[PDB]
């Protein structure tokens, strides 16, 4: 079985870089705290005990309000009067740094105004190893460079709006199947521990770790560790990923929180690098915690050194101050658990004062604008045989497909979106938000046709093929809507347990397109989906004149699309993944059956870096639509490639901040009514053992504490460490690349120039993406695009050296419009 | 068994009044015609042989194109790029003469521009005897006065636009059950003839006949006779309804066409007063006809007088010239049978030149405006506890009910609208048009909310009550949509065979309302339906703050309603029928079982004139919402009732004329150089052997016995006492009393009032009040106006069966003026007038 080597001690924060001020203020306030106050910062108060999906008790005596942590990566979950933004995968389709940033800012503002302190997103894990992975759509792209830039830009958006962003899920949660023991059981599988992602050290650095390094460098204040094991060590107590990779190598200065139920030990986790336990209990509403009372006891009994809990508290506070949250603070002014105005203050036991729990604050501002735009700018034109834009003079328009119409239960009529009815604007699970409304394609396209006095109908039953065929024969254009859905593992739709059972269109979608195309010579396909689908059966039909993929556009869906169909917006989006001929073309098989008896299933990432396009290119498979592909209403030319060569070893000792006293000091205060199921930092009595209630209390302790876990002495700085996101030499710019881009068509538009390198060597991908931009050119207009390659961009991870190395194989640079359309190349000069 | 007395001969046209010029021209052209030409005018060419739902062959030698007859009373049927207008019951709800006329004009324009010569509408039969009749919605109101005025204005709009209108169905087709033998058989009922409406002479004059008198007087060109029997004589060969009531008493100068399959004899029908056979064959595509060849022969063998056939031709030509159809003629430029551009000329057998059958002519203009406006002006505000209008500042709006959303099969995805899926904007059967589009309440209300940055959702599955309650609890206002559907008897939806099985909301409507009202203190109900529905379970719920009935609005439904909900339009519509507490409160039971063995079911109209509000008033039963009831966003006051008395014809017809000559049988044999299209109905004979050419098993059998006394009598006839003009003796239209009242807008916003003028004619068996006059008046806040109207002699008369005439009885009469049939603050005794 794969094994996860220990790395210890857990590195302490140090005021690195842009963290110096936040750190100093964190240390000044933590220095005034008692042990039980510090422990309060680290432990949620229990599932559904307060307002937010996760919530800490705070430090009342120091005016630090409890920290309110709320989903999702795409808008406020479980609230009201909030916006529903497009999914991360749409942000990726835009290839637009500035849109990523604006969508972050827009969300941040909304979160801030609800009294939320920490947004549980954005997401870059799953990266997207498998096309049928249930949560890939929450993230960005299976490409590390694309994902890392847009992930970093989203984080900066959120955090400049004064909310803490949480980069999740760290790391390797590449599938929903077997991610949780209790979920596995509800689906009929018996496992004793969650699925183990088993991955070699090179693959992890070159692929899955890379966006987290960008997040770290961008200043992210929190990271959420994952439900799965990595080499048979749980993600939320993996000393390797947390202490070595995240804190020592990437130099992360913020706080690591657990996924909800991903906390599996008190002492183990704390020493392996975890800083915050969510939602605070061991299981939901168990009234027990691996931390809280236990963490207090563990410090008092000498097992967890004080400097470790001091550091958790400094990391949590430094992040809070880093985004300016102290200046924006207000208690959460909604409840995640009821929409009632009034309710008991503590929802789960229904205890505490009966008072206002919802204030109905409308935080939407004008966010529908950026939503509508981002939807339009994320609609990839995959095929256009001269069919689009529509002119509005189409005599008769057939809108066809359930995916064009309304959810008969209302836009939010399915809990956490756990269905696929009517238009698909949002996939399912925690990664969701309540719509304020939903503009369907039917509504926006019928409104458009009616503005021009045309005739128009929507058929939204996908087995009404008789009606479809009759209408299609009468129509000047047929717009056919199809989708494919997925989501988080705790919800199953039509037998898809999170992950997609297949990449085929849902609800009769292939048969619907064929029924339309067999009858309109101008049949136009619009796909809403969480990732690629199989188009093989109809994409080259002679009557299929255009095909668009619109992702999961959020609340303005129909207007986003209408904007593109009718030429208000020239699509510039590019596919952020590959569209293969068959499922098999992707390889990268999800683990769907027990392969380790009733122990943890073993998920061997035995293809290495070769996911999505890297794998298609390696096997010489030709995708129907390649990574980076998207058409425009204009054409571009790329020419004139020019290349130009450009010109701490130890940490401090772990500090302690403030004083720890006797057990007496941490016993439950006498005046306090203990709320049922509420998690507190206090002890029943000065008897440590009895106050813990742990059947293993005091037994074999030192043997269960790995070597070095309590070593507070100065430590070696890793060669690839020493900065933020890695050693700062990694970000030295070594080569400047320039090309001329011209708009050679007749429509103002955006180009997405894409720069790939070949690093060389028998185990490297043929091409890997490194730089891109989105450039707005009018007809005939030209621009020079210039970009630089850093030391990191040119390197491969060398496991012997434990560092990035520019290997001696010759390297090449490629510039064009997609991973397969690269008309400019050059050998790069040797650099080092 | 009820018996229908003979009335012969069949009255001939005389150029009566406004018909003079059209008659003269018809006579000049029919004088030039051969017998077989004349026959061609009288007989359709066979089901689906040509373009229109009905079509004659015309007279090619005289450059007269075949007449194209097309449904429906609310927009062109079976075509493309036409409009779909609100149903005739919506016109009734407007109580607006001007809107009836404008809708008529917009329809006639579209029909005209398709090359259609005759619109198969509007409808005033059924009148609305039973609240559950399947076709009431195609007509207007169970009130004769309201219905007749709006019927006439509709006819006038159509005909001023250059298309012949057809007043249908004549007469007493008050239900769908048993209306047709093969229809009843398909539903498991074995009858040898169709349902017989059995009505007394006073009831028929005072109720069912009255709107047809208005039609005749307004100049209607065509009348369509009905499927039912009247006292066991078929609608389309009943010499009493056709010869006596319609042609002699009302003095009708145009032509009588059959309903499709309603023609049941050649000789008997022609002598009883039919003028045209549609679609032309005995049954669809039987390649036999009671007319065509048979009518040619019936003249050649002396059984049908030449003057009778000449009279058919003159009435058809006269209706055609009367609307100026000749100045607008073009062949129909669409096909009812296919939407293909190209096809065989003769659809049913697939024969003839393969050529262009569809031109896709866009006839709609900006008619969506009159449709949007009329939908809005026919939305009746039944209840409003200061809930409406909405301001757009509502934070969260819940749109609740299937009836708010889309038909998932597309707006036209049920053939002849034969389902109740999604929003109800058109009921089912032949009274339908293809929508060009359909704006749902969901679309229009969501667009409105979003215009104000509010929050909004539609839940459109009526059993998703869990989601309904959860949403209703968070809403500022819940808009709940419910419907009740019906249609022509050839289509059954959910076992409703034309007629509704009950008056209860469809698709869980009551439970939906209760699920919402139990949770929003601001629950607002919108009803789309063919007529009244049972409201007792929820109308007085403390949480139901407003209730609207919007009928069947046609293509702009959602925009009509939003205009009303958000106060762009102050609603002024008034209920054109009664909302009772129970089905039983209306009495007036449909005949739903065989009650005469396997013979024709007998439908006795025992209630007499006591239908809808007349019956409620007789029985002292209190409607939930009375006939005439409608709220407004303003208030109106009625005062200063005054009455002023005012100062205010041949006795024989000519002899029956004949125009042109009849020659030998051999003149009428199939022309030799002519290919005979399969199923096509021609006027021609196979040989000079009459008997064999006819193929009639009954040819020359007991012929004299089956020709009723007087039926061939071409000599001058007495003029009936109640006859001698258009829509009755012209003395009936003398204005005898002027009425005036001041109507004032006492509220804060502009709006329309609908003053209503009722009379009590007096007598032990007269309704307590019957409507006579109304108008719709637009008033600014504080504005006053003097509403003035007049009562005619007809208005004050009762039908006296012994005189056979209208008579003002000696019982004291009163006038009552107010805002509904139960809200009548002003009363005045009338002085003796005669
Ligand atoms: C001060 O107060 C403190 C607060 O109250 C007191 O704190 C308590 O101290 C106790 C010990 O005194 C703790 O109890 C013991 O904990 C250990 C660790 O359990 C967790 O971690 C397991 C992974 O372990 C590795 O990794 C973590 C870091 O992630 C390290 O810290 C460990 O050192 C260890 O590291 C090695 O491996 C990694 C690579 O993986 C390397 O990198 C290193 O180099 C090392 O090689 C993990 O597997 C555990 O998971 C179990 O528990 C989960 C939580 O419920 C559950 O979801 C999992 O499914 C799994 O369940 C199974 O196991 C548990 C028992 O642990 C059963 O109840 C359950 O039914 C399942 O069977 C967990 O997350 C733990 O391993 C110890 O248990 C072993 O040893 C005892 C005997 O001492 C046996 O009875 C057990 O059966 C068990 O045996 C297994 O392991 C042995 C090898 O160690 C092997 O010999 C056996 O054959 C067998 O396989 C104890 O449970 C306690 O957690 C802690 N409480 C709190 C609140 O923090 C403190 O005592 C007091 N101080 C003083 C001075 O008084
Ligand atoms: C020149 O060319 C012409 C064209 O080719 C030739 O025209 C043909 O002439 C024949 C006569 O020679 C015609 O055949 C006879 O027709 C009659 C009438 O049938 C129709 O009307 C019936 C209702 O009739 C009344 O009302 C009409 C007007 O509405 C009058 O015109 C009638 O005079 C009669 O009037 C009385 O009643 C009304 C009140 O209703 C009063 O107001 C009047 O004062 C009078 O009292 C109607 O019921 C018929 O309906 C049947 O047929 C329909 C299909 O067409 C069908 O939908 C119905 O369900 C119904 O079917 C039942 O009956 C038919 C036969 O008619 C059966 O086949 C069928 O299967 C069912 O049983 C129709 O609409 C008709 O009455 C005659 O038949 C009666 O008499 C014959 C014997 O003479 C019997 O064999 C029959 O069984 C039948 O018996 C009934 O009536 C008797 C009363 O007299 C009674 O004694 C019996 O007991 C019984 O109940 C003949 O069929 C033929 O229609 C016509 N063809 C064309 C194309 O026009 C012409 O001959 C030729 N000239 C010369 C000189 O050569
Ligand atoms: C870790 O996190 C958790 C979660 O955030 C922290 O737990 C919270 O800690 C709070 C203390 O900081 C504690 O707050 C208490 O709430 C009680 C309930 O308040 C509500 O109900 C009342 C009653 O009708 C309303 O007045 C009020 O607005 C609330 O709606 C309060 O009762 C407590 O107030 C008392 O203490 C505060 C100072 O904190 C005084 O200002 C206040 O006047 C009250 O003081 C009396 O009680 C204290 C007992 O400590 C006495 O010292 C003082 O002399 C007063 O005594 C008189 O009155 C009492 C009874 O009223 C009488 O018996 C006595 O004889 C005197 O006459 C206080 O505000 C939260 O409840 C608690 N949350 C939960 C879920 O448990 C935790 O502290 C964190 N841990 C660390 C180390 O930071
Ligand atoms: C009662 O109503 C019916 C139906 O309206 C009438 O029947 C129609 O009568 C017309 C006019 O008489 C018939 O028209 C004839 O059509 C022939 C075929 O037309 C098409 O096919 C050719 C093939 O290439 C095309 O060129 C042509 O444009 C059409 O597309 C024509 O060939 C005829 O013109 C010539 O025909 C005769 C040949 O015998 C010659 O003597 C002449 O040279 C002449 O130019 C003619 O136009 C039509 O077919 C009938 N319809 C049906 C369904 O049968 C009755 O006439 C009417 N009865 C009365 C008494 O009015």
Write the topology of this structure.
The structure is a homodimer.
Chain A (H helix, E strand, L loop, with lengths): L19 H11 L4 H8 L11 E2 L12 E3 L17 H7 L2 H17 L4 E2 L24 H17 L3 E7 L10 H6 L9 E3 L2 H6 L2 H9 L4 E4 L3 E2 L2 E2 L4 H11 L5 E4 L8 H5 L21 H8 L5 H17 L19 E5 L4 E6 L11 H9 L3 E5 L11 E5 L40 H11 L3 E5 L5 H10 L2 E8 L7 E2 L2 E2 L11 H9 L5 E7 L14 E6 L7 H9 L36 E3 L8 H6 L17 E10 L42 H5 L40 E11 L5 E3 L2 E5 L9 E5 L2 E3 L4 E9 L5 E3 L4 E3 L6 E5 L7 E4 L5
Parallel strand pairs in A: 2-3, 3-4, 4-6, 5-7, 5-20, 6-9, 13-14, 13-15, 15-18, 18-19
Antiparallel strand pairs in A: 1-2, 7-8, 10-11, 12-19, 16-17, 21-22, 22-27, 23-26, 24-25, 24-30, 28-29, 30-31
Helix pairs in contact in A: 1-12, 2-12, 4-5, 5-8, 13-17, 14-17, 15-16
Tell me what the structure shows.
The structure is a homodimer. With about 850 residues, chain A is an alpha/beta fold. Chain A contains 19 helices and 31 strands. The first copy, chain A, has three domains: about 1-325, Alpha-Beta Barrel (TIM Barrel), CATH 3.20.20; about 365-635, Glycoside hydrolase family 3 C-terminal domain (Rossmann fold, 3-Layer(aba) Sandwich); about 635-830, no CATH class. Helices cover about 20% and strands about 15% of the residues of chain A. Chain A is globular, with a radius of gyration of 27 Å. Chain A starts with 19 loop residues before the first helix and ends in a 5-residue tail after the last strand. At the A-B interface, helix 14, strand 14 and helix 15 of A face helix 14 and strand 14 of B. The complex binds a molecule of 10 linked components (NAG-NAG-BMA-MAN-MAN-MAN-MAN-MAN-...) (2 copies), a molecule of 7 linked components (NAG-NAG-BMA-MAN-MAN-MAN-MAN) and a molecule of 5 linked components (NAG-NAG-BMA-MAN-MAN). A molecule of 10 linked components (NAG-NAG-BMA-MAN-MAN-MAN-MAN-MAN-...) binds near residues 5, 266, 302 and 701 of chain A. Chain B: This is Beta-glucosidase 1.
């Amino acid at each position: 079985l794969a094994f996860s080597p220990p790395f210890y001690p857990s590195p302490w924060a140090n005021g690195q870089g842009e963290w110096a001020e936040a750190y100093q203020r964190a240390v000044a306030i933590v220095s005034q705290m008692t042990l039980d106050e510090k422990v309060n910062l680290t432990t949620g108060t229990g599932w559904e005990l307060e307002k937010c999906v996760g919530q800490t008790g705070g430090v009342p005596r120091l005016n630090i309000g409890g920290m309110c942590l709320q989903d999702s990566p795409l808008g406020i979950r479980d609230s009201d009067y909030n916006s529903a933004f497009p999914a991360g995968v749409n942000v990726a389709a835009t290839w637009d740094k500035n849109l990523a940033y604006l969508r972050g800012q827009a969300m941040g503002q909304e979160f801030s105004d609800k009294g939320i302190d920490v947004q549980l997103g954005p997401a870059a894990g799953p990266l997207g190893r498998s096309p049928d992975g249930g949560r890939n759509w929450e993230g960005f792209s299976p490409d590390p460079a694309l994902t890392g830039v847009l992930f970093a830009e989203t984080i900066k958006g959120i955090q400049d709006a004064g909310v803490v962003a949480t980069a999740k899920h760290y790391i390797l949660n590449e599938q929903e199947h077997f991610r949780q023991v209790a979920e596995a059981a509800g689906y009929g599988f018996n496992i004793s521990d969650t699925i183990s992602s088993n991955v070699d050290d090179k693959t992890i650095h070159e692929m899955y770790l890379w966006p987290f390094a960008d997040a770290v460098r961008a200043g992210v204040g929190a990271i959420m560790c994952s439900y799965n094991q990595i080499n048979n060590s749980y993600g939320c107590q993996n000393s390797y990923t947390l202490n070595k990779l995240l804190k020592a190598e990437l130099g992360f200065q913020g706080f690591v929180m657990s996924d909800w139920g991903a906390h599996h030990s008190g002492v183990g986790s704390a020493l392996a690098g975890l800083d915050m336990s969510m939602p605070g209990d061991i299981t939901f509403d168990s009234a027990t915690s691996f931390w809280g009372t236990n963490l207090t006891i563990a410090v008092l009994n000498g097992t967890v050194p004080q400097w470790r809990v001091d550091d958790m508290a400094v990391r949590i506070m430094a992040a809070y101050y880093k985004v300016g949250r102290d200046r924006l603070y207000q208690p959460p002014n909604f409840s995640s658990w009821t929409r009632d105005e009034y309710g008991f203050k503590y929802f789960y036991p229904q205890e505490g004062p009966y008072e206002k729990v919802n204030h109905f604050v409308n935080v939407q501002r004008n966010h529908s604008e950026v939503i509508r735009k981002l939807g339009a700018d994320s609609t990839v034109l995959l095929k256009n045989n001269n069919a689009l834009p529509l002119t509005g003079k189409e005599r008769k328009v057939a809108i066809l497909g359930e995916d064009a119409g309304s959810n008969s239960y209302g836009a939010n009529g399915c809990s956490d979106r756990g269905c696929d009815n009517g238009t698909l604007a949002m996939a399912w699970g925690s990664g969701t938000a309540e719509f304020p409304y939903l503009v369907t394609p039917e509504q926006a396209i019928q409104a458009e046709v009616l503005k021009h006095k045309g005739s128009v109908y929507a058929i939204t039953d996908n087995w009404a093929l008789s009606q479809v065929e009759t209408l299609a024969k009468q129509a000047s254009v047929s717009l056919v809507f199809v989708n494919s859905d997925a989501g988080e593992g705790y919800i199953s739709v039509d037998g898809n347990e999170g992950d997609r059972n297949n990449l085929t269109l849902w609800k009769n979608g292939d048969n619907l397109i064929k029924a339309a195309a067999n009858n309109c010579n101008n049949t136009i396909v619009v796909i809403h989906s969480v990732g690629p689908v199989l188009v093989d059966e109809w994409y080259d039909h002679p009557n299929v004149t255009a095909i668009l993929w619109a992702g999961l556009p959020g609340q303005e869906s129909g207007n986003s699309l209408a904007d593109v169909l009718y030429g208000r917006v020239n699509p510039g989006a590019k596919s952020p993944f590959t569209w293969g001929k068959t499922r098999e073309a992707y390889g990268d098989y999800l683990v769907r059956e027990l392969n380790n008896g009733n122990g943890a299933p073993q998920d061997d990432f035995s293809e290495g870096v070769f996911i999505d396009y890297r794998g298609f290119d390696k096997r010489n498979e030709t995708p129907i639509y390649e990574f980076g592909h998207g058409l425009s209403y204009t054409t571009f030319n790329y020419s004139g490639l020019h290349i130009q060569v450009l010109n701490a070893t130890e940490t401090g000792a772990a500090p302690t901040f403030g004083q720890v006293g006797n057990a007496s000091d941490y016993v439950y205060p006498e005046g306090l009514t203990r709320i049922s199921k509420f998690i507190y930092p206090w002890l029943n009595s000065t008897d440590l053992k009895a106050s813990s209630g742990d059947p293993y209390y005091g037994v074999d302790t030192a043997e269960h504490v790995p070597e070095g876990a309590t070593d507070g002495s100065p430590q070696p700085v890793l060669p690839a460490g020493g900065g933020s996101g890695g050693n700062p030499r990694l970000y030295d710019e070594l080569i400047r690349v320039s090309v001329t881009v011209k708009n050679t068509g007749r429509v103002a538009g955006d180009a997405v120039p894409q720069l790939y390198v070949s690093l060389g060597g028998p185990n490297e991908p043929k091409v890997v993406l490194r730089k891109f931009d989105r450039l707005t050119l009018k007809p005939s207009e030209e621009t020079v695009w210039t970009t630089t390659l850093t030391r990191r961009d040119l390197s491969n991870w060398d496991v012997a050296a434990q560092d990035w190395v520019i290997t001696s194989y010759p390297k090449k640079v490629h510039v064009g419009s997609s991973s397969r359309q690269l008309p400019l190349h050059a050998a790069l000069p040797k650099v080092q």
